[PDB]
Amino acid sequence: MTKVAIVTASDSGIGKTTALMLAERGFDIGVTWHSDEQGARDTCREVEAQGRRAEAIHLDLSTLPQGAQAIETLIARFGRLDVLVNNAGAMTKAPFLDMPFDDWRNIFTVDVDGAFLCSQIAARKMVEQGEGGRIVNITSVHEHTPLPEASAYTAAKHALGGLTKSMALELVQHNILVNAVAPGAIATPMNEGSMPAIPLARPGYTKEIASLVAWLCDSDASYTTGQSFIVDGGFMLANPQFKP
Amino acid sequence: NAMTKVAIVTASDSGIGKTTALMLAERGFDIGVTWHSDEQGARDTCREVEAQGRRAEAIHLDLSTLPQGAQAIETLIARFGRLDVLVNNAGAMTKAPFLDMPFDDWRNIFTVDVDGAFLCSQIAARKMVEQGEGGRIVNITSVHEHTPLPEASAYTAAKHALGGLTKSMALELVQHNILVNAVAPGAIATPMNDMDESKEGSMPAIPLARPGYTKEIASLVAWLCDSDASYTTGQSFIVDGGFMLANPQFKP
Amino acid sequence: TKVAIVTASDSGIGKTTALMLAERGFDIGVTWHSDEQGARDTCREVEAQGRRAEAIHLDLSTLPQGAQAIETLIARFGRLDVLVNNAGAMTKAPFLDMPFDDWRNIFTVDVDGAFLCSQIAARKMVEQGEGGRIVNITSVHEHTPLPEASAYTAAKHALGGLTKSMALELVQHNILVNAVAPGAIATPMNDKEGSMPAIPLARPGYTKEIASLVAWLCDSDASYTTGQSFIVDGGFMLANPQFKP
Amino acid sequence: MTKVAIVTASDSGIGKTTALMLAERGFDIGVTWHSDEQGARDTCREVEAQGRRAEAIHLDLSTLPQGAQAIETLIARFGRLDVLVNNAGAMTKAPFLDMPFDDWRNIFTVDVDGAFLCSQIAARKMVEQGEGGRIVNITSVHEHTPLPEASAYTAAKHALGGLTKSMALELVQHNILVNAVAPGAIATPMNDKEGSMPAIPLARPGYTKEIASLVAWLCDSDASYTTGQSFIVDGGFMLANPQFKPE
């Protein structure tokens, strides 16, 4: 009866803050971790401390399609699925001229291939239930504008943005709404005026991004699909004419 | 214990503005209501806003005759003594073929659809700057901020202009912690169908196959006005049911 | 012989465009705001290439009267096939205190003028039944804000939206409508490598680098291009807060 | 020295018309073919019929990264390289829910992995010469808007759109300008009529010359201020939203 949300990489950072906020809104949370399992255990306890069920599982998206079957197992532990938040990994810089081909392919494996497989498994279950669903892909401002010395990261983020539009169009008949949240600079887990290149002059806290993800998963977002919501402190506004 | 933040929502006598005012009042905002000619509808919004324990002040705003009509924003600010949120809600769309459009009709559409938002935003931003406590401005545009509406070239151009104004205001007021964003809605249900709840399949050209309820737009506007949206500025959030996805390859 | 009217072709992008359209075989309608003898320089250089050239005074600062010169210039040629709406000068003004008449005057010359000129030009092209081309010179600030110039940015966005509407409403008449969005343009004196390190190409653009694309959008190979904004900016749109010159 | 331009998949279609127009503008043409080797010879002959040298070689993008080494061989025949055009392959449809993971990865191989490796090879040589360069990627309108039942093709076109912006930014100090041309519906080689696609505003698909001409312009000397952009040539495809009523 209680709706279920699976938030990948919810052991720390933006994923964990999203899992907490989806638990506040009343979702049972399926937590996923790559290595920091204790961080996932902390997230599960904080979700249970809210009076909601929390399940954790290991999922390694660097090896596909095998590493994506953990979504199937997590769904069976709950018996239903309503929300999938595909969270974004870390960014790696690599100059374009000398980038190894396998490094280029590995970034696509982590930054779009995993989300594609996890969304397929999620979308199938949501089609069976016939009650709709929400799939939110965490991209980046670099879904739209290039990041210097990070051509593969920029291209994979653009690919995930294109997958978001496609998924939203093909699943609209099943009332499965698919959107992307495009964060700008995200403050480190340890963390005013520290980043003057950004118009807001600081990185964003995880709750300033996780809150919009939570809104997209709730009842009132029932007319929003196919879109990429940019939460970036004005990042997209700063062109060469902008002097801080 | 902090002083009650006040929000002004223009054209909040019905439709998106009415629903936004209610949801902002639900979030603890005192509401400044505005009506163009439906004075009774604005009193109904005030009654419902007051029903939640919030103060409601209404006033007549005639954005067709500027810059005089924009002074009503000053009057609402005087009643509350402060201002924290401004929502520039959109007037109705009128069609006119591009080839046969009088130059005064073209100018009038810009008067109501971007000039009014510009003048109201100035007064509001000036107040927020004087307070030094930041603020929020949300411009309600349209999907036609981004894609043309046939037989509505002035509407489309003015919506694009308000989109550009939104980005400029966001860049120019960011040091005052005044965040400025647009909400770009698709097809909205008329008040007869909006209150009736459930019209599925009535607009198959749109992927979601129906118009949106005012609640489905106002909820995002209200989110942009509250504390969690403190890192969102300069953006245009499209709430359209897939309208933007539908190209010539789309089959209803 | 086809006729191309180019506004503000007494200097700058408008003149280089007018000359390039003349090499492509167009008769050129030249327009001047104040520099009449500069317009005659354009007419003379167009005539040196075998084309007919005419000039007329156009002032879009006062509408709808100032736009009637287009109608008069059309009557001298009898036909019209190409209209290029050039972009006037940019003036800054802070948003909080900008006077309302300054806001309205920027919309008058930067989108209202293009509206009336395009309306007249499109009317003539419909009657001929042979299609046509309308090219609006916008700016990168059709898409991204210019600091301290909110009215300039809003009007450039507006002309961008008008371009799409005109393209969609006129497509059945084979009138293709597009925009060209220039970045920084060198002054006629410089028309340098490293003078603008904020821009990725590190320099402004020459008028031939903008006008060449405008001329392409006016010829027969651009017969499938409509409703678009072509950005020629040396990478201006690429430079975000992560770009370090 | 005669400037050299490599046009991938120039054995037919847009790549063929782009090669002939680049030859008309004075380029020596390096021709690439996946399977129609006779088409590449026809392209080589038509290029030579305009007073230009043409060289052909097999390029198998279905097997990387050694398959892209044919670009290094093609450069060695000319000794220099000035422009590279990464032309698109064919489009295949596959529903999202049941699409196999290998078909998804294969589409990315042919539609962005190939252009990535070819652009690395071309860009390095352009840096050696120090005389600037041009790279033009043929994407699609579906770099920007979804194609129904083709999520992998859409995602890969977006990816190539992102690579275009990244390349243009990192290569700009070497005067290597990188742009994309995003075509809409293109006519088949037999038809390359009016009113055949009323859903499109121009009510017809585009001719290959209508797309190749802009590609050729982006490669010539007057496009020296244009980089990082995606030029959409679609007959108003992008303008058509649910409010468009075909006349």
A interface test, pick of D61, D66, D97 with most A CB neighbours within 10 Å: D97
* Contact call for residues C238 and D165 (beta carbons, < 8 A): yes
- Across the interface, which of C168, C172, C232 has its CB nearest the CB of D225? C232
Cα diameter, chain B: 58
B interface test, pick of C85, C138, C157 with most B CB neighbours within 10 Å: C157
Contacts of D244 (CB under 8 A, 6+ apart): B150, C168, D201
B157 with C161: Cβ contact below 8 A: yes
C165 with B156: Cβ contact below 8 A: yes
In the DSSP assignment, the letter for residue D206 is B
**All chains having 3 or more CB pairs closer than 8 angstroms to chain D:** A, B, C
Residue D207 annotated among the catalytic residues of the structure: no
CA distance D48 to C91: 53
List chain D residues with CB under 8 Å of A176. none
Tokens of B115: 């000039």
Q: Could you tell me which chain B residue has the CA closest to the CA of A219?
A: B216
Q: Which residues of B206-218 are buried (b: 16+ CB within 10 A; e: fewer)?
A: bbbbbbbbbbbbb
Q: Given the residues B29, B155, B213, B243, select the one marked as catalytic.
A: B155
- Across the interface, which of D237, D243, D245 has its CB nearest the CB of B248? D237
Tokens of D87: 């032309």
Chain A residues whose C-beta sits inside 8 Å of any chain D C-beta: 64-65, 95-97, 99, 101, 104-105, 108, 112-113, 116-117, 120, 123-124, 127, 142-143, 145-151, 154-163, 165-171, 226
Chain B residues whose C-beta sits inside 8 Å of any chain C C-beta: 66-67, 97-99, 101, 103, 106-107, 110, 114-115, 118-119, 122, 125-126, 129, 144-145, 147-153, 156-165, 167-173, 234
- Across the interface, which of C107, C145, C155 has its CB nearest the CB of B167? C145
Q: Given the residues A33, A78, A116, A153, select the one marked as catalytic.
A: A153
CA distance C99 to C81: 39
A interface test, pick of D106, D144, D151, D227 with most A CB neighbours within 10 Å: D151
CA distance B37 to chain C (A): 25
CA distance C186 to C166: 30
A96 with D170: Cβ contact below 8 A: yes
C interface test, pick of B94, B100, B120, B153 with most C CB neighbours within 10 Å: B153
First to last CA, chain A: 51
Bin B233: left if φ > 0, else alpha if -120 < ψ < 50, else beta. Answer: beta
C interface test, pick of B165, B175, B180, B181 with most C CB neighbours within 10 Å: B165
* Helices B116-131, B72-80: inter-axial angle, 10-degree rounding: 30
- Across the interface, which of D233, D239, D247 has its CB nearest the CB of C224? D233
Size of interface A-C (CB pairs under 8 A): 40
CA distance B30 to B21: 9
Q: Could you tell me which chain C residue has the CA closest to the CA of A238?
A: C240
- Across the interface, which of C107, C141, C161 has its CB nearest the CB of B160? C161
A242 with C196: Cβ contact below 8 A: no
Q: Which three-class secondary structure string do you get for chain C?
A: CCEEEECCCCCHHHHHHHHHHHHCCCEEEEEECCCHHHHHHHHHHHHCCCCCEEEEECCCCCCCHHHHHHHHHHHHHCCCCEEEECCCCCCCECCCCCCHHHHHHHHHHHHHHHHHHHHHHHHHHHHHCCCEEEEEECCHHHCCCCCCEHHHHHHHHHHHHHHHHHHHHCHHHCEEEEEEEECCECCCCCCCCCCCCCCCCCCCECHHHHHHHHHHHHCHHHCCCCCCEEEECCCHHHCCCCCCC
Q: What backbone torsions phi and psi does residue A136 show, to the nearest 5 degrees?
A: -120, 120
D14, D182, C121, C82 alpha-carbon torsion, rounded to 10°: -40
List chain B residues with CB under 8 Å of C158. 110, 114, 157-158, 160-161, 164
**All chains having 3 or more CB pairs closer than 8 angstroms to chain C:** A, B, D
CA distance D179 to D207: 21
List chain A residues with CB under 8 Å of D171. 96
What kind of experiment solved this structure? Answer: X-ray
CA distance B125 to D213: 49
* Contact call for residues B20 and B222 (beta carbons, < 8 A): yes
* Contact call for residues C210 and C182 (beta carbons, < 8 A): yes
Question: Among A113, A227, A122, which Cα is nearest to A174's?
Answer: A122
Question: Among C128, C135, C129, C133, which Cα is nearest to C220's?
Answer: C133
C225 with D233: Cβ contact below 8 A: yes
Question: Among D183, D243, C162, A171, which Cα is nearest to B246's?
Answer: D243
- Across the interface, which of A209, A227, A231 has its CB nearest the CB of B238? A227
Give residue B249's domain range. Answer: 1-252
C221 with D209: Cβ contact below 8 A: yes
- Map residue B35 onto helix, strand or coil: strand
* Contact call for residues C141 and C95 (beta carbons, < 8 A): no
- Across the interface, which of C149, C155, C166 has its CB nearest the CB of B153? C166
C166 with B66: Cβ contact below 8 A: no
CA distance C91 to C233: 20
Sheet-wide strand order for C27-32: C53-57, C27-32, C3-6, C82-85, C132-137, C175-182, C229-232
CA B235: distance to chain centroid?
Answer: 14
DSSP string covering chain A = ---EEEETTTTSHHHHHHHHHHHHTT-EEEEEESS-HHHHHHHHHHHHTTT--EEEEE--TTSTTGGGTHHHHHHHHHT---EEEE-------B-STT--HHHHHHHHIIIIIHHHHHHHHHHHHHHHHTS-EEEEEE--GGGTSPPTTBHHHHHHHHHHHHHHHHHHHHTGGGTEEEEEEEE--B--TT---S-TTSTT-SPBPHHHHHHHHHHHTSGGGTT--S-EEEESTTGGG--TT---
Q: Report the CATH number at residue B133.
A: 3.40.50.720
Q: Given the residues C32, C77, C115, C152, select the one marked as catalytic.
A: C152
In terms of Cβ atoms closer than 10 Å to its own Cβ (0-12, 13-18, 19+), residue D189 is exposed
- Across the interface, which of A169, A222, A232 has its CB nearest the CB of B242? A169
CA distance B64 to chain A (A): 31
Chain B residues whose C-beta sits inside 8 Å of any chain A C-beta: 167, 170-171, 174, 186, 207-209, 212-213, 215-217, 219-220, 223, 228-235, 237-242, 244-245, 250
Query: What is the number of domains present in chain B?
Result: 1
Q: Is the dihedral of CA B8, B13, B14, B19 positive or negative?
A: positive
C interface test, pick of A154, A198, A241 with most C CB neighbours within 10 Å: A241
Q: Could you tell me which chain A residue has the CA closest to the CA of B241?
A: A223
Chain D residues whose C-beta sits inside 8 Å of any chain A C-beta: 64-65, 95-97, 99, 101, 104-105, 108, 112-113, 116-117, 120, 123-124, 127, 142-143, 145-151, 154-163, 165-171, 228
The letter for the amino acid at A109 is T
Percentages (nearest 5) of helix, strand, coil residues in chain D: 45, 15, 40
Size of interface B-C (CB pairs under 8 A): 124
List chain A residues with CB under 8 Å of D150. 166
D202 with C171: Cβ contact below 8 A: yes
Question: Among C166, C164, C155, which Cα is nearest to C126's?
Answer: C166
CA distance B42 to chain C (A): 28
Tokens of C158: 């507006």
